Design a protein around this ligand. Structure first.
Ligand code: ANP
Length: 346
């Protein structure tokens, strides 16, 4: 069994010349030579079968990634697992080798306006497909956007993705939530379970702002300090936007806050393309119902060098019902993963 930072990384003979490229909360990621396609590739060792939570996110991500075929969404090339449920402890996901991600890029590289444009175009082109599948990503952030040496951008990490369910979105004030704090839409803290498409556009808008300045625009240290950062810049919600918040705890919190005027994007980003700041504004709308949708973003003048709706495909087979996973035992979930991975077995 090949070892890597000697654990087991048993991608047997087909995949060789392993090297560490990070880890996580499910397993470890490696580069590796594919002795069949003569090309380096990424491999994610996932060991989730101990905890029902890990099995859900793994089942979720594999189902979605197998259903999705799109240039700007990471593909699965292969899955390595034991031929039997009893022998299967780990699963290995084989994926196109991507040389970096937007997080790693933003810490060290200044982006030209052409790069920011093209990156944002590819993010929304990928998100248009995702949203057309009635899926919500719900964890869009720079580390979840992978790049190769020719700046092709692929969206990954569908662990927290749900089927859109806007009828059942409403919830109380300060409702708990799992996805990256800095990219969380204001309604998440206020009255939203994160079950409508507009939560992804908010995250994309945060990513645009980050690409313009190499800093996260809303670096809140905790849950309510996230809301303080957003209104620190958008200013106080209008009566109209408050009118939409019917839940009295959320409403009275927002009423309790001192008046703050809108801080206009040009003073935050004086070097930015004005068309970029215009699109940023529509993406970072306090009111989810007023927030630009993915197809309108793609049609924005900022993206006109790329905009081609004939070349921005939608999904053939959208998810038409929620994935009823929430309290299935981690034993049924291993079975479902076994079954979802069968097509890659010889
Ligand atoms: N296809 C890939 N090509 C190259 N590097 C990758 C690829 N997928 C992940 N990585 C890198 O491997 C490391 C592990 O991160 P990553 O796997 O993205 O996060 P995780 O917390 O393990 N789970 P997830 O976000 O769902 O993918 C990071 O440095 C990633 O950028």
């Amino acid at each position: 069994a090949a070892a890597a930072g000697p654990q087991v990384f048993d991608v047997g003979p087909r995949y060789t010349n392993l090297s560490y490229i990070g880890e996580g909360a499910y397993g470890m990621v490696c580069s590796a030579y594919d002795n069949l396609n003569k090309v380096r590739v990424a491999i994610k060792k996932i060991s989730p079968f101990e905890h029902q939570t890990y099995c859900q996110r793994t089942l979720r991500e594999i189902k979605i990634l197998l259903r999705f075929r799109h240039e700007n969404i990471i593909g699965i090339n292969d899955i390595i697992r034991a031929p039997t449920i009893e022998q299967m402890k780990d699963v290995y996901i084989v994926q196109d080798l991507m040389e970096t991600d937007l997080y790693k890029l933003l810490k060290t590289q200044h982006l030209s306006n052409d790069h920011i444009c093209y990156f944002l175009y590819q993010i929304l082109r990928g998100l248009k497909y995702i949203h057309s599948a009635n899926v919500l990503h719900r964890d869009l952030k720079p580390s979840n956007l992978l790049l190769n040496t020719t700046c092709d951008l692929k969206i990954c990490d569908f662990g927290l993705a749900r089927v859109a369910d806007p009828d059942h979105d409403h919830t109380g004030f300060l409702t708990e939530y799992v996805a990256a704090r800095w990219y969380r839409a204001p309604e998440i803290m206020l009255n939203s379970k994160g079950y409508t498409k507009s939560i992804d556009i908010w995250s994309v808008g945060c990513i645009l702002a980050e690409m313009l300045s190499n800093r996260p625009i809303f670096p809140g240290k905790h849950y309510l300090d996230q809301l303080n950062h957003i209104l620190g810049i958008l200013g106080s919600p209008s009566q109209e936007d408050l009118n939409c918040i019917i839940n009295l705890k959320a409403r009275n919190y927002l009423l309790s806050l001192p008046h703050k005027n809108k801080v206009p994007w040009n003073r935050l980003f004086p070097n930015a393309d004005s068309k970029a700041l215009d699109l940023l504004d529509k993406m970072l709308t306090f009111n989810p119902h007023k927030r630009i949708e993915v197809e309108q973003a793609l049609a924005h003048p900022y993206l006109e060098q790329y905009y081609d709706p004939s070349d921005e495909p939608i999904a053939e087979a959208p998810f038409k019902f929620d994935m009823e996973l929430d309290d299935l035992p981690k034993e049924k979930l291993k079975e479902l993963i076994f079954e979802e991975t069968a097509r890659f077995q010889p």
